[PDB]
Design a protein around this nucleic acid. Sequence first.
DNA 1: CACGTACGCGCTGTCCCCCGCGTTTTAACCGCCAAGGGGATTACTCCCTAGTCTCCAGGCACGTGTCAGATATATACATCCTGTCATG
Length: 75
Amino acid sequence: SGPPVSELITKAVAASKERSGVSLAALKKALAAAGYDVEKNNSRIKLGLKSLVSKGTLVQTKGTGASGSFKLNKK
DNA sequence: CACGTACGCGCTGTCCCCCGCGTTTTAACCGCCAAGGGGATTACTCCCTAGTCTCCAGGCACGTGTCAGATATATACATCCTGTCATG
């Protein structure tokens, strides 16, 4: 069970906060380094990485959907 | 060996498109029949060319010898990275 993976993905994206945002590749490598499965739950991450762009907590920098770069909200 | 910039591509995102299904049409298929065109076969007679003795002729073997381009040296651009400034 454990906590839902939204908190895990927020820790993964808040770990670095590069000026050019994290790729989907680098964030799933961070989640795999954390230990969360990224191979069978990649549909769950696939929907989560656009749900988080949609709800406004995180904004997408340069890519589209779950592609490209990502950064935190202004406030 | 070592600094450095770019490369493959992973994964979604998002448009895009082409098979699945099904129907409708239509001429392909079938199958049936008429007819003749030349493929093929036989005949005939004619071209046509390899060979050969010989005879002569040019092209390679070989030597050489002399200037076109290799080599070398001094110049000019290329160009590409670097440096600098206006602007969204």
